[PDB]
Amino acid sequence: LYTVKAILILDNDGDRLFAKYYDDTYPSVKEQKAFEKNIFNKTHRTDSEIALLEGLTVVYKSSIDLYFYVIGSSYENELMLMAVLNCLFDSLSQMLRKNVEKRALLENMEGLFLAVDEIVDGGVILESDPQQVVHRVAL
Amino acid sequence: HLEKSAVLQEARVFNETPINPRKCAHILTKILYLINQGEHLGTTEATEAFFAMTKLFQSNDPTLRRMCYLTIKEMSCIAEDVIIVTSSLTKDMTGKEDNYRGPAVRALCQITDSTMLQAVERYMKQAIVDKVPSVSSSALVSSLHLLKCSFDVVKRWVNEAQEAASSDNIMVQYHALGLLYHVRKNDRLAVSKMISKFTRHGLKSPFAYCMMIRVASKQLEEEDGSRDSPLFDFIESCLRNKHEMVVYEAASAIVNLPGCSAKELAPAVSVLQLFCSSPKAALRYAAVRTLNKVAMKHPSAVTACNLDLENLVTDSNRSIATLAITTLLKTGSESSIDRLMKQISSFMSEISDEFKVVVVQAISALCQKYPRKHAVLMNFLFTMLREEGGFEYKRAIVDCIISIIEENSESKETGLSHLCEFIEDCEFTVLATRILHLLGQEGPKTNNPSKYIRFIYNRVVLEHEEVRAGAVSALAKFGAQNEEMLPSILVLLKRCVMDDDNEVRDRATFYLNVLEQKQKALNAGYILNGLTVSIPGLEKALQQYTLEPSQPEKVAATRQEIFQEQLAAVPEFQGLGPLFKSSPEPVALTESETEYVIRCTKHTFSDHLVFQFDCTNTLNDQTLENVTVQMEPTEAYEVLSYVPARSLPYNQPGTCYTLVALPTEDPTAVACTFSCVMKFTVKDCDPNTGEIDEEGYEDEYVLEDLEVTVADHIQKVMKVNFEAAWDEVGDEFEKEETFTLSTIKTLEEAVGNIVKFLGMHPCERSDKVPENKNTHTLLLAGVFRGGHDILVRSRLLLLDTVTMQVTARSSEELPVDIILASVG
Amino acid sequence: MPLRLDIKRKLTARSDRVKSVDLHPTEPWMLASLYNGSVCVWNHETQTLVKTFEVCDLPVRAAKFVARKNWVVTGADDMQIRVFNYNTLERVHMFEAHSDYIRCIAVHPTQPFILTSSDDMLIKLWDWDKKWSCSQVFEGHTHYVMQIVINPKDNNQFASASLDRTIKVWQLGSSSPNFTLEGHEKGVNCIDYYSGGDKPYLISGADDRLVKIWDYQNKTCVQTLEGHAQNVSCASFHPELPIIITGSEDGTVRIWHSSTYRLESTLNYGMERVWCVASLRGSNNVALGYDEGSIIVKLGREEPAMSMDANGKIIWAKHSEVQQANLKAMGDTEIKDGERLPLAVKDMGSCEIYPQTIQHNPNGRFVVVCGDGEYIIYTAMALRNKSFGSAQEFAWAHDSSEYAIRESNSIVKIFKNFKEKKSFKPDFGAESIYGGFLLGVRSVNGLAFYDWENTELIRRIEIQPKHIFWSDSGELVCIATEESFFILKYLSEKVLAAQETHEGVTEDGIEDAFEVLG
């Protein structure tokens, strides 16, 4: 039981606006931020549903001032990961009552924290239905 | 954003009277923020905050409940007296609504430990069966965590877990099947039953397919009892649902290790399954690939090629381009290498920085991995040296040089020499070390060492200590290997450079003094070619693969020797007949990893047989001591001694032996059957590998019989001329008996049966007899135990069945009698 | 979900609508209270009617035995509970239990009390020893008090079910109900406890077609049982077996497994409208009151499944330090023959099926769990899946590496190494199987013995068996029979000539190949 390695929603530098680690491989801030900077540097300023970083398929999207991440295994493809990443974007948008930017996330830090935990649970994909997550969470 | 101290502190008011759901929920949000933003909690304040929050569980608000679940999990480990929160979580967990249901099970189960396991079970059973994915999936992941604390509680849930498995809802199923596989496992077979039930089904759950593919990927033919095929009717071997990841995972395993063979609607040996998905968008990345494939990656490679090769060349996007190189690499092979190398050459042009280093490494690495000649590898290694000039490193000097001395060395030094012309001190410590090491070691007569020396001499001045030190020591070895060289050593070493710097001086003082002053017994000894400091494997090629898209020794050779070694350690067996031979037909008494694994071999000596029983107690509940394998011979054999296996704990082999004396007058065979029973003392054990209880009971385990054949007594040989040998061994021990082999209708099978049974190789290759000939003479030879030859002559008559008069002669009465009896 | 059952009609009696059914507290008799104005009791073991009492000329809704006094209490539409001696046949006492007819009576053997529940919305207490003075009156219920039951963990507590959508738990001491449960939504016909020293449970039955299970400790509703496809008249808990037995006015009784509530059975009788249920507290008899009579029914599972090998793994299923679903048990203890020896269990690995029968191999190499038309073989002391097979029945033979199975195609099967043997397939039909070397198969009022050599009919013995067990030489057999017992000789040589010849008839055999030794 494992698909998603980690989820990060990063500003346009790779610094932690947010990350919640569905791996046990980053718990300390220094390394959680390093990871975040690492994934953001590869993936950014080339938007696609694919990136390969650290031998893992990284699926990412972007907004005005954020890049949104799911990191998962590379034995899969973008599309499986993408379903998590689409939930992540979508659910935060509907939850916060505003599209994902740094402003929406900061506006409601609580909605963001709770919403992401419903999407991924210890690296298993707990939820992937944006609607379900949003009802499930209370602001 | 926040300060961890202030927020951890103000949380302590909850512990008293104030509960205020708004204030506390905010304070909680702040805790989650401190972690999220990236901060580390202080333990005293954390411990205090944790005891305080539990009061807050009284007020049931969905946002406050939510805050409470995330905060207790994060604060759980950095907190004390957490046990109080279990009750509050159960209270929450039974409360209907997904907000409580799912999030509570997860928070509760994380905090829950084997004592507490029992409490959560009613609520867990109710939460697992849900086709509402949140409650069920959270409960299913929760159960996975709980397998650690206590296995047994979780196991009972297998029925609720299975119930979820029957959903086609993606989460409920993914979680249900995945978890089940982990849970119910006590043997392979019970998990396999769980998988077969879902297996025939065309799911609309890609995640379940994926998690299951992995379980499935190996051939399973015991799914739900048994079945006649490795069959997976869920995409693993089938292609019921198309979706490029699932399709890729499935297609690479099935092709050359069938999960099932190819179907018209589901390729599974053929290369196709990947390829139909292959032209695509970003999605293509899974689709385009390969791995394994029938019979090679290469017929496969051609399909996909348009896609991988155009993206790889065109896209100087890192994200696309990486998928394109990995995809090229995958469609690759030995054959593909011509194509792969041009592409990789081309690739650096798109992304050129580290990627440059990687392509010049890749083209060499691929040439070493997939052979386009070892020479070409060196020539590519020159191109790597040329292009980068510094992203070669120290590990490269050792790897290039070791690799080079397989063939390239004279050339490599020379190439290196040219390469050294580059750049005087920006070329790095490493290239200078490579030309230096190679010029030292080869001692060029292929080119004049004077260019090399002149090139190295300049480099040393302005480059690091390690090379300058390298240069003096190399020179010294260079002196010892070649006499000629000594004059250059002296001009170089007197200089302030190759000696008299710092490290360079110390090494030099030593190396110099040994060459200059001393005998050079030492210097001579020291150069064995002038080789590197270590010989590793070929490091580059694996490194390169990931990086781009970002002494077994033996004594025995014969069964008799290995056994003889095992026997020899024990005295009795070599003291009481020495070993002629040990069986060429050792029989395993009891099957592997059941109750016992016992393999017995019968060993023949001059007048004895020793039976070595290698005994394993694979009994999980026991550990054994004082174990022996007891024996009842079915003929006149004396059982002299038993040697015990000292201990046989769980899954640990031990050996026990029975020594018996052979008859040497027996009129009937030494082909004989012994009934084996192992007897032992059991002390109770908790399965690990071993552990004994303070007291225990006697127990016995029955074993299979050991059969001793004439084949064990005789070692086979053929003779150039049977007739002489046949007379020579002893016609004075001659006895003749006539047999009918009615179950063998031709001579060729007949000769084979006497040859196998007796352990005699028929002379002159007499196992091949003129097909269906009326008379034939079969010549047998071999040596019997004690070291005496046994020859047997069987004059075959072929009617419709085989009749033979078998006459045997031997240097003893016993082989003759033994052969004659065993055959019939 | 599977469960050891075997429904049997112990005794039936036809009479006008029997509101209550009872088992005598300590006797083998069952009393049914009828709308004949009569209550009647019959001992449904010897099939003797012990006595009848004419309580009233108008329906007697309730009747129970107060076994200690050797008296029976009845409550009839006289609005009286009248007491009689059931061996000295006369009316011990007459008293007005209520202002309305008495639906149910509950007896406290440990106290002098009967509390009776009546449709005057009140339950009253009477003390038999005072000559049926009114000890206490309970006022709480605002509707027709259909049934009363005493909690077996505190007899001072009882619950009463009333059609007021609650079952109220009361204490004797307190007129008022000390707490209320809202057990049903369309009135509560019945209350029962799930019996035992550690079982705080209630059940509610209602005319919303449904029976509901409640836990009185936690106060939540554990589950809802489908009950019947029409108003559930009564519902009760079986003590021993995990099931709930319910009755409905559709003439149907259903049995539900109390672990997943999936339908174990549906029973109709041609008596119809099933008003009540009650269960024996010592377990495996339930009795159900119908419009056209009463029935006493006997439920299955009377005996345990277990087998003792030579490894000291004596395996059972269920019990202590063993689960039912998984398999375990060991017994290495040899303490004195005069008492029962400890459980002495040691843990044993995996299982995948339910144990209809669960058995160790007679010399210890296999374990078999049989269940649901399938057999699964697990290894003696390691319990890894060895083998699998088909078996509605599984029996180890004498050989115990050859076994007999009923695969239920109308031929008794032998499986050897847990792989089917088709050299074994009776020229009888089958109706049932006996193991041992010569497989006995029962068909057409015969017991036929078949060869594991060519499956010809060796002999037929004209008294069918209970069992065949064959010695471990396979010449001597021990036949358990209604005759009593046979020992028979199989003369091996005589069988070899006879079987080859096939002189043994398809369904009658050759009377020489076997001979009757004793």
PDB file of all heavy atoms in Angstrom, chain C residues 215-232, unseen atoms left out:
ATOM      1  N   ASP C 215     -27.035  -3.406  22.724  1.00  0.00           N
ATOM      2  CA  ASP C 215     -26.166  -3.557  23.849  1.00  0.00           C
ATOM      3  C   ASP C 215     -26.530  -2.655  25.016  1.00  0.00           C
ATOM      4  O   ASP C 215     -26.450  -1.432  24.862  1.00  0.00           O
ATOM      5  N   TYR C 216     -27.002  -3.201  26.200  1.00  0.00           N
ATOM      6  CA  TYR C 216     -27.446  -2.404  27.345  1.00  0.00           C
ATOM      7  C   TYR C 216     -26.276  -1.738  28.045  1.00  0.00           C
ATOM      8  O   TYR C 216     -26.409  -0.626  28.587  1.00  0.00           O
ATOM      9  N   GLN C 217     -25.051  -2.329  27.955  1.00  0.00           N
ATOM     10  CA  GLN C 217     -23.846  -1.694  28.484  1.00  0.00           C
ATOM     11  C   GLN C 217     -23.434  -0.421  27.835  1.00  0.00           C
ATOM     12  O   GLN C 217     -23.038   0.578  28.406  1.00  0.00           O
ATOM     13  N   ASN C 218     -23.472  -0.380  26.471  1.00  0.00           N
ATOM     14  CA  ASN C 218     -22.974   0.757  25.702  1.00  0.00           C
ATOM     15  C   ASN C 218     -24.074   1.713  25.408  1.00  0.00           C
ATOM     16  O   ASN C 218     -23.727   2.920  25.318  1.00  0.00           O
ATOM     17  N   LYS C 219     -25.332   1.125  25.349  1.00  0.00           N
ATOM     18  CA  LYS C 219     -26.677   1.763  25.086  1.00  0.00           C
ATOM     19  C   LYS C 219     -27.010   2.030  23.648  1.00  0.00           C
ATOM     20  O   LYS C 219     -28.025   2.708  23.440  1.00  0.00           O
ATOM     21  N   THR C 220     -26.157   1.554  22.718  1.00  0.00           N
ATOM     22  CA  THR C 220     -26.236   1.773  21.303  1.00  0.00           C
ATOM     23  C   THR C 220     -26.946   0.562  20.817  1.00  0.00           C
ATOM     24  O   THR C 220     -27.190  -0.417  21.469  1.00  0.00           O
ATOM     25  N   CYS C 221     -27.347   0.673  19.549  1.00  0.00           N
ATOM     26  CA  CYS C 221     -28.012  -0.356  18.782  1.00  0.00           C
ATOM     27  C   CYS C 221     -26.899  -0.975  17.982  1.00  0.00           C
ATOM     28  O   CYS C 221     -26.281  -0.361  17.089  1.00  0.00           O
ATOM     29  N   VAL C 222     -26.584  -2.231  18.273  1.00  0.00           N
ATOM     30  CA  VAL C 222     -25.568  -2.927  17.634  1.00  0.00           C
ATOM     31  C   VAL C 222     -25.848  -3.147  16.184  1.00  0.00           C
ATOM     32  O   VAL C 222     -24.983  -2.839  15.330  1.00  0.00           O
ATOM     33  N   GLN C 223     -27.035  -3.679  15.822  1.00  0.00           N
ATOM     34  CA  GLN C 223     -27.367  -3.926  14.385  1.00  0.00           C
ATOM     35  C   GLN C 223     -28.860  -4.058  14.267  1.00  0.00           C
ATOM     36  O   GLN C 223     -29.551  -4.246  15.278  1.00  0.00           O
ATOM     37  N   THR C 224     -29.374  -4.057  12.981  1.00  0.00           N
ATOM     38  CA  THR C 224     -30.764  -4.286  12.756  1.00  0.00           C
ATOM     39  C   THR C 224     -30.880  -5.477  11.894  1.00  0.00           C
ATOM     40  O   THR C 224     -30.098  -5.651  10.923  1.00  0.00           O
ATOM     41  N   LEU C 225     -31.828  -6.315  12.336  1.00  0.00           N
ATOM     42  CA  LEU C 225     -32.063  -7.569  11.712  1.00  0.00           C
ATOM     43  C   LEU C 225     -33.296  -7.495  10.943  1.00  0.00           C
ATOM     44  O   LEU C 225     -34.271  -6.917  11.371  1.00  0.00           O
ATOM     45  N   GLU C 226     -33.173  -8.040   9.747  1.00  0.00           N
ATOM     46  CA  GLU C 226     -34.247  -7.948   8.743  1.00  0.00           C
ATOM     47  C   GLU C 226     -35.475  -8.642   9.265  1.00  0.00           C
ATOM     48  O   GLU C 226     -36.588  -8.098   9.112  1.00  0.00           O
ATOM     49  N   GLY C 227     -35.287  -9.722  10.090  1.00  0.00           N
ATOM     50  CA  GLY C 227     -36.398 -10.238  10.884  1.00  0.00           C
ATOM     51  C   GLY C 227     -37.193 -11.123  10.103  1.00  0.00           C
ATOM     52  O   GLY C 227     -36.966 -12.308  10.059  1.00  0.00           O
ATOM     53  N   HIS C 228     -38.171 -10.480   9.395  1.00  0.00           N
ATOM     54  CA  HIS C 228     -39.100 -11.123   8.524  1.00  0.00           C
ATOM     55  C   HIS C 228     -39.531 -10.101   7.616  1.00  0.00           C
ATOM     56  O   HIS C 228     -39.266  -8.897   7.734  1.00  0.00           O
ATOM     57  N   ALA C 229     -40.220 -10.531   6.603  1.00  0.00           N
ATOM     58  CA  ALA C 229     -40.856  -9.819   5.511  1.00  0.00           C
ATOM     59  C   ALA C 229     -42.283  -9.466   5.930  1.00  0.00           C
ATOM     60  O   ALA C 229     -42.958  -8.939   5.065  1.00  0.00           O
ATOM     61  N   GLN C 230     -42.528  -9.452   7.287  1.00  0.00           N
ATOM     62  CA  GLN C 230     -43.773  -8.946   7.754  1.00  0.00           C
ATOM     63  C   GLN C 230     -43.497  -8.757   9.209  1.00  0.00           C
ATOM     64  O   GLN C 230     -42.483  -9.280   9.762  1.00  0.00           O
ATOM     65  N   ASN C 231     -44.404  -8.003   9.931  1.00  0.00           N
ATOM     66  CA  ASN C 231     -44.255  -7.619  11.284  1.00  0.00           C
ATOM     67  C   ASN C 231     -43.700  -8.652  12.176  1.00  0.00           C
ATOM     68  O   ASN C 231     -44.110  -9.801  12.072  1.00  0.00           O
ATOM     69  N   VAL C 232     -42.626  -8.268  12.901  1.00  0.00           N
ATOM     70  CA  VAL C 232     -41.937  -9.286  13.666  1.00  0.00           C
ATOM     71  C   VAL C 232     -42.738  -9.321  14.923  1.00  0.00           C
ATOM     72  O   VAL C 232     -42.904  -8.332  15.702  1.00  0.00           O
TER      73      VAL C 232
END
